[model samples]
Target: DTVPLPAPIIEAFPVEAIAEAIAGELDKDSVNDTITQADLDTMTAIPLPSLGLTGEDLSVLNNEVFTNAIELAIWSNNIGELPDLSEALPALENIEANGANITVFPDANYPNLTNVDLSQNNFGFNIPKFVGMEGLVSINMENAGLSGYIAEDIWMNMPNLDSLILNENHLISIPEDIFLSQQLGTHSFANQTATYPPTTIKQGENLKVFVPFIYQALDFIAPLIIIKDNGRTLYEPPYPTYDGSYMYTIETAGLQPGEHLLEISLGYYTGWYDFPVTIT
Candidate 1:
């Protein structure tokens, strides 16, 4: 009695398309057991869109499938506000806060939050304080509505932070110690939406600058006509340096010899950009 169970009708569930397909169901169930509390803290990535989630659907899915996990990512969603995830996910660490109206960080008991992405949100002035957590490593405010002076204490306290991205915000000035922080390996403030060039840095060896517009770059080096042994400011010109597409060049006097980082961001208020240069 060997009869092949009628060929199981198979359908394609394209990646990130978000459908109630077998792959998503299997993920919801299988990951539930394998992803323990510890895994929530260590897990590096997860795609919520693959679970057929968006907006409030994400809130519902968080309650159902993501009960055991914490680290979550749901990029390119139409979320308006920060969902109340503390009730379900208590140990959420790395969160993608992109494309949401989450003006403020939830007053939840997220003691294990190490990395947070507030990109493309409506947050302004009132930046959340990361006090309790002693292991915070990264915080991204790219394209967020952040304005005013970024608190020095916030940057000073985060001794373990490796990256701090605040591009496309309303930030005009950065705290002095921020450039001096020994823990900061990478930092970005490209989209000078508020003001440009006026923002200066002490120029550490590992420091990298990303500008949103070529105008900002021109403004940055217009005054500092002479480059000392410190470092030179590189930029992607508005018009092609030659006769092709735009070009990027170091616009200072003498170039230092060593490893350095250079980033160029050229676009409108909310558009894409690129970074092309040699670290050496």
Candidate 2:
């Protein structure tokens, strides 16, 4: 049997109004996984907005229910502010708010969080707010417009952190100690000199390009490594096999006999090394 809303509640708010009020929850799958306004109304569930509740609405809900709804993916929801969930969803483990207009992050600390993606938002240098999240394993803040120096202690405390994406930000300086962690498998930073290849090579021989020490230092799985000949692009070798220390072998079998420009790049740091190779 379906539960029905009280006569007064139904009369005060139409099904369409209720649907509109809780659209955010529906998009985030926080409410019953109803697809349409009619379906949601048929379930006779009260909308969060209709109750005049904000993110704190979780506090009023049962702990089990709130915890069960902790895996939130509220991307591009026009969410201007985040609600405090310190005591509301203690079981929250993953949250993705990419492309949301979030200006402020929740003041509450998340102890059990393991993955978070707040990319393409309006948040600033508020990364320190998540410093104590020891359980965090992945973080993506790309193009979030963050600025200022990242504190050294934050990296030291996040021992379990493996994937960190902060590209397209305005960070002034990154602490060197952060790279020392063998647990850090994915991290990107400013450009540095790359290892050079041989200036001349036999026509049928493969030119070997060794990766610099800076790239070999990290435990990155499959970092981007691009190779180009002249202005035309050439190849991207197998990932783990050609990872830095493993070396990338560029075939010069079909290349015309002359001086050619060979360029190699890694991720955002393109053109790290380019030199003329005389193929004979």
RMSD of each: 15.8, 13.2
**Cα lDDT of model 2 by residue, 1-280, tens digit:** 1223322222323343333444454453333333432433332232232233323332332221233445655565555566665553556777777776666676457777898888877766565457446788988877786655455445566768898776666554344566656677997654433324448887777677544422442433334666689867887764344242445556677887888888765553222456578988
Model 1, TM vs. native: 0.48
RMSD of 1: 15.8
lDDT of 1 by residue, 202-247 (tens): 3232333332233333323432121112233354454322233223
What is the Cα-based lDDT of residue 89 in candidate 2? 52
**TM per candidate:** 0.48, 0.48
lDDT, candidate 2, at 198:
46
What clash count goes with each model?
2, 0
Q: Which lDDT values do the candidates have, in the order given?
A: 0.49, 0.56
Error of 2 at 251 (Å): 44
> Relative to the unseen true structure, what is the C-alpha lDDT of residue 190 in candidate 1, on a scale of 0 to 100?
66
Best by lDDT: 2
Off by over 4 Å in 1: 1-23, 26-46, 50-67, 131-133, 195-280
Worst 10 residues of 2 by lDDT: 1-10
